[PDB]
Amino acid sequence: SAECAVANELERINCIPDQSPTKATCDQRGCCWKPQGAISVPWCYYSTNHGYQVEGDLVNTNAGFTAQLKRLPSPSLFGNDINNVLLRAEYQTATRFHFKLTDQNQDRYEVPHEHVQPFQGNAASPLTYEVMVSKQPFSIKVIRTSNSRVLFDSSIGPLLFADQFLQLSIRLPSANVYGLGEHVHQQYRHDMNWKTWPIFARDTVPNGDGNNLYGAQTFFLCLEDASGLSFGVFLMNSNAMEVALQPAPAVTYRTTGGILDFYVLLGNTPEQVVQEYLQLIGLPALPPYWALGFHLSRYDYETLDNMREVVERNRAAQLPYDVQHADIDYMDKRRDFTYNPVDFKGFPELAQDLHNNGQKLVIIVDPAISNDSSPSSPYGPYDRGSDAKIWVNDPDGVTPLIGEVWPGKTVFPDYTNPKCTTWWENEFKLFHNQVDFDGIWIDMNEVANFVDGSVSGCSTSNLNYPPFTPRILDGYLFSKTLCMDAVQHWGKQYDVHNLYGYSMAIATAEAVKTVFSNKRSFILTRSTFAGSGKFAAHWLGDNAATWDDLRWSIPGMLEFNLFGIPMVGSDICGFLLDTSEELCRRWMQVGAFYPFSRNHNGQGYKVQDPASFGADSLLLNSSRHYLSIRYTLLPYLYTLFYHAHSRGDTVARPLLHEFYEDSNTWDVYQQFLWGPGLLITPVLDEGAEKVTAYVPDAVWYDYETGGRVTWRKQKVEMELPGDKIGLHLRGGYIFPTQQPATTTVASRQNPLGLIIALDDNKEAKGELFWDDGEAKDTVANKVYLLYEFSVTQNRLDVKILQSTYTDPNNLVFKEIKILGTQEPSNVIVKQNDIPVQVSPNVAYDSNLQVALITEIELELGKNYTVEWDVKIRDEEKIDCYPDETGASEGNCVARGCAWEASTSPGVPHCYFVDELYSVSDVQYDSFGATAAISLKSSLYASALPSVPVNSLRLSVTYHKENMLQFKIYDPSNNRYEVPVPLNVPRVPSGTSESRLYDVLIKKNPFGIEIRRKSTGTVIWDSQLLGFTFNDMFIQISTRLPSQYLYGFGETEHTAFRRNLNWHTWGMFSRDQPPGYKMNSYGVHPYYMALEEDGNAHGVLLLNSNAMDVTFQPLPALTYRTTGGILDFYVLLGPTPELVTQQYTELIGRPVMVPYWSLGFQLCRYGYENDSEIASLYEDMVAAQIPYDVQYSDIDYMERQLDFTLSPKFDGFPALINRMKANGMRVILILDPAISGNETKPYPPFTRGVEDDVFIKYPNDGSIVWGKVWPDFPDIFVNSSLDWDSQVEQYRAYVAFPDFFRNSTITWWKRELRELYTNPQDPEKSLKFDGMWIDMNEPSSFVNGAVSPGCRDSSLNHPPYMPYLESRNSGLSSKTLCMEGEQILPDGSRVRHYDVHSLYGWSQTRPTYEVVQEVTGERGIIISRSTYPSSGRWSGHWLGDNTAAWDQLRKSIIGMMEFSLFGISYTGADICGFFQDAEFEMCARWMQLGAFYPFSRNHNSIGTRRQDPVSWNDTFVNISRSVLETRYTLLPYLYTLMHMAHTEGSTVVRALLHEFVSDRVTWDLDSQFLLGPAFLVSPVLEPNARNVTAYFPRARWYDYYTGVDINARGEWRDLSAPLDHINLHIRGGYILPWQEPAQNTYFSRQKFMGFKVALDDDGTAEGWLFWDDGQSIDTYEQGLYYLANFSVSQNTMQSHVIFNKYISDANPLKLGYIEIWGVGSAPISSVSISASGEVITPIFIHDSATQVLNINVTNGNLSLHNFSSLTWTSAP
């Protein structure tokens, strides 16, 4: 039916909570029966026929509205249903709603709360909430206006309102619910899974059976979401009740009487909700200072002497101890207001003894008074009480009810009776006159009774046996308490039971006012109600000495802070059972940080006071150590109690109250805070020396050392030995301290101190409340000191806010401890701006960054300012004067910098001390962060090179889970941005949950911090001095995550890893032969860094302007650019390979090369004619040395003029065609510069002056003329002139095309199309297969332009010249003018000054496109000048090397660096370009060079021939051998290129890419990998016939023998004769290979094979990519073969991923399979499964070498038909 229509089984409200459900009761109650459901879900639920309806409308009133409600016709559940109910709502405050539901005709019981008085005000306006009332069925709804969230919804279930049964169900916005009490909940956040909690005060042990305990708390807090927005609910009802939780989420209150009186409290944070609640029920009492000390107690010390012995022992141990408790043993026969005259003779003297030692006495007092009084043995308390008629009475209202407790048969005082309060006061006065005690411990105030009801039992009434009972222990209300019909002043026990303890605390608080003189005392109670914390402290009851109770103590303590009873703790070491030393040790450690810290032992158990465990025990030493820490921090703790008392803050706090933005804190219950500042992490498990703890997102300092921890927003395993607890100070807070003593009396006479814990912005704040520590109402009477402390910019402000109290002890602040600071210097103290004559001492620990300032005397009660300067250590110094000339003390100071002529090499004399920019408007959004940066120091910014930029914007974008961008730019003016397109997501995906990183914007100074979320490692930190942003000078610095950095180019690095020891490297494209600290052909502002744990990241700066980078040993890196904006991209890894795959995804994946380009190549600068190339070709073929590509340098051209053919090369076209017919490929070189001095028709220049393609001067529009290769026509070029004379007399004037321009692109494609197919003579055509574009830096042999020269000196000689080669010659050195103008594709004008380093990049793509068009095949481009994204279309060679021995290792470093740059096709000129080759060097270089991806032997003009057929037959044999090896491996190499192209894997690989765990590989650059599996270990030294190589922890097989050298993690010297190169295959890999031939054309027709290298587990994996090796976009158009191959359990399987290339019509023939590491057992049989056929191949197994060779050449097997191969061993 539609009545039973409950959408969701989780929204069912249990209709039969009182018994097991049957369809019979569900039918009588008119509900809905459905036994379909999960566990714990109701089967009988309420219909919609149950509830009330609004009659009429909502009549409005002065405070809110009133509504009349009539009951809907439904069956009665428990009888006596109230038909007419009145709703009275009130808008008391902007953040406090109150509504009440009561009977309309009769008056019912309402809680007489002492603090909460009837509201008489009018409705508040505006409100932060809205209230909605539904008419039928009736429901109330409270909605937060700011976000329209429903906080409180009563529609989920019906309103039930009967005489002895009331119910209201509320749907909640979230499942984050806290509170409800008193119970052992076991966890802090509630389990909303069908759990019911009874609330009815009862004397019973807390044990985790979900029973009701000593108090009654109905308040709960709910955290809406991670904004902090929170609300609370409070029900003012004292009757017996239960609260049921359901997973909707919803809360149901079920009570046995009274009214429904609700308060809804709103707050922006959890703490504000608590504050609102406490302001309504009553703010907690401020305890006496001595009560914050440590307390000792036992039930049954037996005699006074035993008690004294305990006192003396603990004193002798010098344990911090201030209060002794006396339990019922001190009394006479367990009677109150008495002491035993025999066993406790001298009790008053004990009190005096404690006082003479600065200790206090707390005595116990029970509510029950012995009724045993006779004339012969009078008992005064009873007689006086009976005379006053102040007892709880039987139902007749006259006869005192008789119960039983400790003294036997007892009467119970009625504390709700005012006469009782007077009696109570008087009794305390008479006993205080006998024994001078300091505080009162009230117990058994539930009220407890050893019998049920009374000695005579309870009557059969509906009060003692109500129709509904709330799941209370034992199932009757009058169990171990009084009869429910018992009569008190406030009402029947049925209504006021839960108020008994509350009422007694009130009466006791009144007594204290009279007995103690103007002294706030201390009241400790067990039974509590809402508002009890205004009078008394609370303890969590009779726990047991178990690890569970230790664990449960923390959530209990946290809840009571919510309830407004912050002075709370559990019995340390357990009340019941004997404690172990370990348990008591780990409890004393955490117990030291309970707000109420007391050790309390039960009767008949082993002693457990700390000194009992022995004077040298670890427990005693540990207890003394952490109790001393507690005493040091009492001023801090006391101030927290002040905030609790004055405002309603929580003292012991949950982590979600401070860090609610992290959902990893919403359920933390094994850690807690004191206030906002002190994190406590205990060990709560037996035998544990480690804990898993959450460290929230803040700066944290180890309390004991003062050092900063590296944890932040991460789960950590904390090492906490038996004597250690986790204590951490939060940054941004100041902690008042006092030198500790054994008592609070003694400590308060000692000097004060400050701990200043600095945050990210280098700031902190604190407070200090200080009074007499004892007097009453010291806050309302305003007799106190209040200080506010603040630190900013190295200045401490000590400000008094209140000063009406004077301390008699002349206290002073003597020490200031600063955490997270640099060494303070020149400390100055002022008192109201007047200098104090003092010379403070500073002790500093540089390792911990902790400073101690002593010999200061800041008198308590006065205002002070303390200022200091900071000293910068040499390692943290940043060059303030990196300029080329003008360094001096004078010019340094003019920049606002500091000068120090230190001697340490590398350290700068002039360094920054101040910041130029400030940060503001820091906003953190879901997909990024933004901030405004504003110039503060205009004068000093203007002393640095170039004009400052005033306004800057910082934009952080979270692109992906592993990639982010941060940009700093000028929002007011468009500045140059690099026009190189990058690949970023269209919509951000760096979702907070998935992303691998966090970003933080810091102040003082401005800095961006990026952290790896998983380990908390900071990979980028710009919080260094030096940030400058001028028009032509921008500086930025970062701290490095370690000392391992790789990248930056292009230059000749000494090693693969950078030397971070004061070294500067310039970047600006230049024609410079590679050298030390010299800028070369390309620019790659990219680096990869290794973190100390082996995680890796990468950083790109997208800037093309001239720049340099500096490395300091901090470690730190600084970037200094001459223009542009700051545009950084960060890749998160975490692996070196994943970083490169991420980097290449951003900048573009490497180009797929043609198969023939992987063959060996020959070139020489200085071929005399076409016949010399023909002779070399024939000789190579004759010698059978494989080679695929022949090149020609600028010799085939007429006078080096581009797009011409020299007469000496008239036969070159025919030769090209002949070579091609035999399978050879030709690459030609093209230069960019075009001659303007031709007398005969020269189409290139004429058609380019017509199209306007050349770079011209900014405004006039003349061509910027340079000089490069073309000679003048009709002159005689003597070859005996020097280089300088030839450039001045023989070189023609040349014009440089602008390759950014559309017209230039069109003109360049036409010239190349006509070079391929000559439009005039169709015979002078040159049918090339690829192009070599050289001299594109652009390079000129003059500086700037032909003389007269350049024009704008401002751009050619810039304000800041980076550390470039020929630094004094300017940016125009060996290049074009910087004023030259270029035009982007969209028409925008740019200066050569901005785009110089993009010149080669801009030429590359057009060249690539035209080659693919004229040849119809993919082709290959090789450029000298490269920029990030250049590898998408071209390869790169490492430039003009020299024939020298050091150049072979430099080649290995260059190839590994270009692999990180995303250029896979690279190599060096084999045998050197400059100087004559030597035989041995050339032989070894041939062996190394055979494993370059780009493997070319190239030589300069003038030198001896260095090609393989130029030496002797020994060389021919070495060359042939190694090159045959190369051609065998081409399928493997080709597959690697495919993987680079498609996935962004690296081809040439440093060992650290595959073995990052071994730190030995972090410095290796003399060996390398091809892909993951092939290790190359060359000889790079002369005369050597051996090589020392490292073998990472893996199985490594000798390539030539198949035998595994056993070297796992070891160095090994390997034999390396002149005709040998050491090659090794890693186990676990399958390598495809093919039989070598003269060139790739013939080789591809031969048989293909597999080398299968098994790992230790006998497994291997590998890949094969195969296509036609030359067509365009074979993978994109789907004409290829791709397969993976695997071996396990002696079976090799083929898994074809894709195949539309290899077929029966086009077979790839499989011939050979070699399996290595098959074991020593003989191989009996080998079988191949192919095309549903079994082929038995020919096989040979060598048991000694463990190599199995399988030959399948006879079976005509094409690879696409191969399924699996299986081999079986001899048993």
Ligand SMILES: C[C@H]1O[C@H](O[C@H]2[C@H](O)[C@@H](O)[C@@H](O[C@H]3[C@H](O)[C@@H](O)[C@@H](O[C@H]4[C@H](O)[C@@H](O)[C@H](O)O[C@@H]4CO)O[C@@H]3CO)O[C@@H]2CO)[C@H](O)[C@@H](O)[C@@H]1N[C@H]1C=C(CO)[C@@H](O)[C@H](O)[C@H]1O
């Ligand atoms: C001192 C104490 O005296 C009275 O308590 C009695 C109680 O009435 C008995 O029920 C009995 O307690 C047993 C528990 O009921 C029973 O469950 C079992 O408890 C287990 C728990 O279930 C386990 O979970 C826990 O791990 O271990 C305990 C025991 O190991 O066994 C209990 C027997 O130990 O005995 C106790 C006495 O031990 C009285 O009712 C209590 O209120 C009273 N405590 C207050 C009085 C005094 C004396 O001045 C103060 O010192 C205390 O601080 C007060 O709280």
Ligand SMILES: *[C@@H]1O[C@H](CO[C@@H]2O[C@@H](C)[C@@H](O)[C@@H](O)[C@@H]2O)[C@@H](O[C@@H]2O[C@H](CO)[C@@H](O)[C@H](O)[C@H]2NC(C)=O)[C@H](O)[C@H]1NC(C)=O
């Ligand atoms: C093609 O050129 C070769 C080589 O030229 C010589 O070496 C050049 C670097 C340069 O110095 C030239 O002036 C040289 O002539 C020519 O072969 C040489 O021919 C001369 C006779 O003219 C002979 O004495 C040399 O031994 C030859 N050198 C070699 C290395 O073989 C050749 O004649 C030219 N071919 C044509 C068709 O002109």
Ligand SMILES: *[C@@H]1O[C@H](CO[C@@H]2O[C@@H](C)[C@@H](O)[C@@H](O)[C@@H]2O)[C@@H](O[C@@H]2O[C@H](CO)[C@@H](O)[C@H](O)[C@H]2NC(C)=O)[C@H](O)[C@H]1NC(C)=O
């Ligand atoms: C590997 O070589 C070392 C070094 O050999 C010398 O240096 C080479 C670069 C080359 O110039 C060789 O001709 C040199 O002999 C061997 O160690 C030397 O062995 C000789 C022979 O007794 C001895 O006299 C030298 O003092 C050694 N020098 C050094 C530097 O150790 C080494 O034995 C070879 N490794 C193995 C295991 O064969």
Ligand SMILES: *[C@@H]1O[C@H](CO)[C@@H](O[C@@H]2O[C@H](CO)[C@@H](O)[C@H](O)[C@H]2NC(C)=O)[C@H](O)[C@H]1NC(C)=O
């Ligand atoms: C203490 O209280 C008890 C209970 O009220 C009193 O004892 C009862 O006294 C009557 C006679 O008046 C006896 O018949 C009962 O047997 C007693 N009760 C029980 C349960 O045994 C006792 O008089 C009181 N003591 C005083 C007032 O000194």
Ligand SMILES: *[C@@H]1O[C@H](CO)[C@@H](O[C@@H]2O[C@H](CO)[C@@H](O)[C@H](O)[C@H]2NC(C)=O)[C@H](O)[C@H]1NC(C)=O
């Ligand atoms: C090929 O040339 C090499 C180097 O010119 C010759 O090897 C050298 O021979 C001399 C003796 O004639 C030895 O003293 C050197 O140590 C050798 N140098 C090496 C090995 O690099 C080699 O003999 C020649 N082979 C021939 C002529 O076929």
Ligand SMILES: *[C@@H]1O[C@H](CO)[C@@H](O[C@@H]2O[C@H](CO)[C@@H](O)[C@H](O)[C@H]2NC(C)=O)[C@H](O)[C@H]1NC(C)=O
């Ligand atoms: C080799 O290729 C096969 C497909 O032929 C890959 O198989 C898939 O592997 C993923 C996990 O990586 C599984 O979720 C898929 O179900 C697999 N598909 C099939 C068809 O089995 C395999 O991962 C590749 N790697 C190797 C060497 O086995």
Ligand SMILES: *[C@@H]1O[C@H](CO)[C@@H](O[C@@H]2O[C@H](CO)[C@@H](O)[C@H](O)[C@H]2NC(C)=O)[C@H](O)[C@H]1NC(C)=O
């Ligand atoms: C692989 O097996 C083939 C047979 O299918 C072998 O080929 C023969 O080799 C012998 C010895 O050189 C020659 O006499 C025959 O003329 C070869 N026949 C063919 C079909 O070429 C081949 O030698 C084996 N390869 C290896 C390395 O063992």
Ligand SMILES: *[C@@H]1O[C@H](CO)[C@@H](O)[C@H](O)[C@H]1NC(C)=O
């Ligand atoms: C080339 O230069 C040499 C060296 O000075 C000179 O002797 C010779 O005559 C020149 N050749 C010419 C100009 O024919």
Ligand SMILES: *[C@@H]1O[C@H](CO)[C@@H](O)[C@H](O)[C@H]1NC(C)=O
């Ligand atoms: C070179 O190899 C050939 C062919 O194996 C061999 O005959 C010759 O002896 C080897 N040595 C030299 C120096 O020619």
